[PDB]
Design a protein around this ligand. Structure first.
Ligand SMILES: OC[C@H]1O[C@@H](O[C@H]2[C@H](O)[C@@H](O)[C@@H](O)O[C@@H]2CO)[C@H](O)[C@@H](O)[C@H]1O
Ligand SMILES: C[C@@H]1O[C@@H](O)[C@@H](O)[C@H](O)[C@@H]1O
Ligand SMILES: [Ca+2]
Ligand SMILES: [Ca+2]
Length: 887
């Protein structure tokens, strides 16, 4: 019974599905454009398919997460893009900073660049395709449907051809490390097809072979760019013997005749490893082949029913954690509409309320689905710009694949991991944590070359004990931590502080001690790096403060300013978090310090880069207090640059060079303290009005809401949510759905970029629940990371319910509301932490707490603004119910 499952579903194959939305760069080929707008993704965090659902020549576009060009072996001098001749072991940066300190508003930052060789950078590759050719004379069908069952983690295709009902089922199992295709024909003798696996023609190879052994084909080779070994295998299994399984008449296929029912077991691997400097397992071609062979052998020995059960079990265990009911229709509703038609209706303004709710909740749920498919606990790599799904390939960076489908760390990679915790998929953040840990070794090289932070043995010094690791915007599978070849996107060292927010949240949401140790080690060394090498006393262009020196604000404005709001906001957050992590550990390193004898003069350095006063206070508390990251400009906006006057102008009325004149720059790099950070909050709201002014300019021309890239709308959804304005937040949700989603619900730039799918999920979470702020009651008592129920509920969602969301401190949160106000909150304490609960839609002072059959003593505390929390002790594993006071 699949009647209660969430489906995306279509009444026609990918080839006949609407692909008329903006294609974007790199998708001028019709077939590639069709791919990104209309195919349905599935994956196990490692391998992925995108299903076309073609009646005759069926196609599943195929990926493996580690098929990456570039890195060691791409040249004989691979050093992660670092240009020693430009960086001069920090000397270049030190001299440019002195020019800024001496009053310059900008400098020529041309030698703060690197990463010049595109072959060394490399990119993510589409592996190729699986073709299942049914031979058919005509493609004439009835009762056709293709779907993606998000609830069971599988794709389905069904049609009736010539009296024969055909079925296809595809999934990729994490427990058994295998992709499965189940193919059936209704009447015996009537399942005939050829199975092949061509690799993308557009990457170079060395010694590729397609081979047929038993019921198994193997494509096998090495990448020509870097020697990376790849191997994929399809094992065909006819149902209990019946059918002619023969080698294809071209040596490169397997032919099935006169079945019945078939199960294909599909597996793939490379010899990649996240292991600096070699990035290889050290396997031979023959070893890779044996490995891959086992996975399909074992899958085949388990059999279809067993592997399917284990996959659905594993998938639904994570997928079913969160339920949402806004009064949506679904695939089983009377009058149900296909997903492509629903999208068109929503865009037209012809969709009913129920259909609008169906699209909004489907998109929400798809962001959770896509996380499960691209980013599992045992993935070798986090989700990239496209998750794990791509059709394009070329050897070099900045080539055939847009932005190399890379790890883009000046908003996109961060966005990928915004909903991971709040949407109850905490374990799925593990590959991100490992990736950032993976940046330490190569980033120590960058830190040395560009900022003069030398770790004595960068390969064997534990994380936390080195001098610092530096990385920038464009990153890869191979420690490409160098700044890019052009400064005006390439230089962004605060990328690391930022991604460390995503990493630190793993601890904030769980309270796990093992995670605390890992996040502490990362924060300690990056905080060390900034304090000792990056920060300097600002010159006159940036006022009285420590700044981060030569800066670029992603991705507009002047090149090489004396810090900026982006870097200062992020370093402020990082120090805030480092201090919190140190405190949770007992501050065993004595690094928190204090603000006694605290001055930006404490950062004076001699010619060598050693501090003039070895003993001056440069503690984490001191540095934090000296950043002063937020300044309000003459349009009442948060300034993006410290010399800013009115919006996008200098104090003299001239235009800020490189500022996007219509005010709609996609990035909002100066508002990171509002979201995802904790600098500007509803409780600490000194700069809330300015953040809202800045947001209005970045989203509106007068009273008219502007479109933008899918990810940019996604960040705006989250930012507006943190302000408490549900109505404006919802307008941005509608905008994203109308203007940045293809028929397959992939978010687009254009072209397809997955970050906005993840940002949508996060944004909806922040509407319904926030947990990042600090409450101060009238007596000065602080409640950090209090649970905020319904902080930005739109008037459009008058009633509904949600369960399974996660708040910081490790609480599971369900809430039911009607007439715009909470009727029940269910709070499950997972760690036994003291609860502190705000009910924004209703007022917590009007409610009371129970533990099953008993009343809980909850204290009502309020602040200056007449807002209240319910404050109560809890025990691990207990669910508390909060309901309106009853007589
Ligand atoms: O060259 C790498 C940088 O590309 C920027 O994206 C450009 C894109 O390459 C160009 O074709 C044009 O259309 O504008 C885009 C945005 O300016 C990235 O934004 C930057 O991060 C680098 O990847
Ligand atoms: C993946 C890329 O990330 C940043 O470079 C943005 O400025 C681009 O517009 C694009 O979204
Ligand atoms: Ca992955
Ligand atoms: Ca926080």
């Amino acid at each position: 019974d699949t009647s209660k499952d969430d489906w995306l579903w279509y009444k026609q194959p990918a080839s006949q599905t609407d692909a008329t939305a903006t294609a974007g760069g790199n998708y001028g080929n019709p077939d590639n454009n069709r791919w990104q707008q209309t195919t349905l993704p599935f994956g196990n965090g490692k391998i992925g398919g995108t299903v076309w659902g073609e009646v005759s020549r069926e196609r599943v576009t195929f990926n493996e997460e580690t098929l990456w060009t570039g890195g060691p072996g791409s040249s004989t001098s691979y050093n992660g893009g670092n240009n020693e001749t430009k960086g001069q072991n920090g000397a270049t940066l030190r001299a440019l900073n002195k020019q800024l300190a001496n009053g310059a508003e900008t400098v020529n930052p041309g030698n703060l660049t690197g990463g010049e060789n595109a072959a060394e950078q490399g990119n993510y590759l589409n592996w190729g395709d699986i073709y299942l050719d049914y031979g058919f004379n005509d493609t004439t069908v009835t009762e056709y449907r293709r779907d993606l069952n998000l609830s069971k983690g599988k794709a389905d295709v069904t049609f009736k051809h010539d009296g024969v009902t055909y079925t296809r089922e595809y999934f990729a199992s994490n427990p058994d490390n295998v992709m499965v295709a189940r193919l059936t024909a209704s009447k015996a003798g009537k399942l005939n097809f050829n199975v092949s696996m061509p690799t993308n023609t557009n990457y170079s190879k060395t010694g590729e072979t397609t081979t047929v052994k038993g019921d198994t084909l193997t494509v096998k080779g090495a990448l020509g760019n870097n020697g990376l070994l790849y191997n994929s295998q399809i094992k065909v299994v006819l149902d209990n013997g019946e059918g002619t399984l023969s080698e294809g008449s071209d040596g490169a296929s397997l032919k099935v005749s006169d079945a019945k029912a078939v199960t294909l077991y599909i597996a793939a691997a490379t010899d990649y490893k996240q292991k600096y400097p070699s990035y290889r397992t050290g396997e031979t071609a023959a070893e890779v082949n044996t490995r891959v062979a086992k996975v399909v052998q074992d899958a085949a020995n388990k059999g279809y029913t067993a592997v399917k059960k284990a996959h659905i079990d594993d998938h639904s265990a994570i997928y079913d954690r969160v339920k949402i009911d806004l009064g949506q229709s679904g695939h089983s509703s009377d009058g149900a509409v296909a997903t492509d038609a629903l999208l068109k209706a929503y865009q037209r303004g012809s969709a009913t309320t129920a259909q609008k709710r169906e699209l909004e909740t489907l998109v929400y749920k798809y962001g959770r689905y896509l996380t499960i498919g691209s980013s599992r606990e045992n993935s070798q790599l986090p989700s990239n710009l496209q998750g794990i799904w791509s059709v394009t390939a070329g050897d070099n960076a900045h080539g055939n694949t847009p932005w190399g489908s890379d790890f883009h760390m000046n908003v996109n990679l961060q966005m990928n991991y915004w909903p991971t915790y709040s949407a109850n998929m905490g374990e799925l953040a593990e590959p991100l944590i490992e990736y950032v840990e993976g940046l330490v070794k190569p980033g120590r090289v960058t830190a040395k070359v560009y900022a003069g932070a030398e770790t004595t043995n960068p390969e064997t010094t534990p994380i936390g004990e080195g001098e610092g690791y530096m990385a920038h915007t464009e990153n890869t599978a191979y420690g490409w931590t160098a700044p890019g070849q052009s400064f005006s996107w390439g230089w962004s060292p605060a990328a690391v502080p930022w991604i460390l927010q995503n990493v630190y949240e793993a601890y904030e949401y769980s309270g796990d001690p093992a995670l605390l140790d890992r996040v502490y080690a990362l924060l300690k060394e990056e905080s060390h790096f900034y304090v000792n090498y990056m920060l300097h006393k600002a010159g006159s262009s940036s006022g009285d403060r420590l700044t981060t020196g030569v800066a670029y604000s992603p991705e507009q404005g002047p090149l090489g300013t004396d810090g900026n709001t982006y870097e200062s906001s992020l370093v402020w957050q990082m120090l805030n978090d480092a201090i919190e992590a140190a405190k949770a550990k007992g501050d065993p390193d004595g690094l928190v310090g204090n603000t006694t004898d605290c001055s930006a003069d404490n950062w004076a350095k001699n010619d060598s880069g050693n501090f003039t006063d070895a003993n001056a206070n440069r503690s984490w508390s001191c540095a934090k207090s000296l950043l002063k990251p937020i300044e309000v400009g003459d349009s009442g906006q948060i300034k993006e640059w410290y010399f800013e006057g009115a919006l996008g102008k200098k104090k003299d009325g001239s235009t800020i060079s490189g500022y996007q004149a219509d005010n709609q720059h996609r990035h909002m790099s100066h508002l990171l303290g509002l979201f995802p950070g904790d600098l500007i909050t509803i409780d600490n709201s000194e700069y809330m009005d300015a953040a809202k002014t800045s947001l209005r300019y970045r989203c509106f021309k007068g009273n008219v809401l502007q479109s933008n890239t899918g990810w940019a709308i996604g960040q705006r959804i989250n930012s507006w949510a943190r302000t408490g304005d549900g109505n404006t937040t919802y307008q941005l949700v509608e905008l994203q759905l109308k203007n940045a989603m293809y028929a397959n619900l992939f978010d687009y730039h254009a072209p397809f970029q997955i970050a906005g799918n993840f940002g949508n999920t996060s944004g909806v979470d922040e509407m319904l629940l926030q947990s990042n702020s600090t409450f101060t009651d009238t007596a000065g008592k602080k409640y950090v990371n209090y649970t905020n129920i319904l902080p930005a509920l739109p008037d459009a969602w008058a009633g509904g319910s949600v369960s399974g969301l996660v708040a910081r401190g490790n609480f599971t949160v369900g809430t039911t509301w009607k007439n715009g106000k909470a009727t029940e909150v269910r709070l499950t304490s997972n760690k036994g932490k003291q609860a502190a609960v705000k009910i924004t839609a209703g007022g917590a002072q009007n409610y009371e707490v129970k533990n099953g059959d008993t009343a809980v003593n909850a204290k009502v505390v309020t602040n200056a603004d007449g807002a209240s929390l319910l404050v109560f002790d809890t025990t691990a594993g207990t669910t508390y119910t909060i309901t309106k006071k009853a007589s």
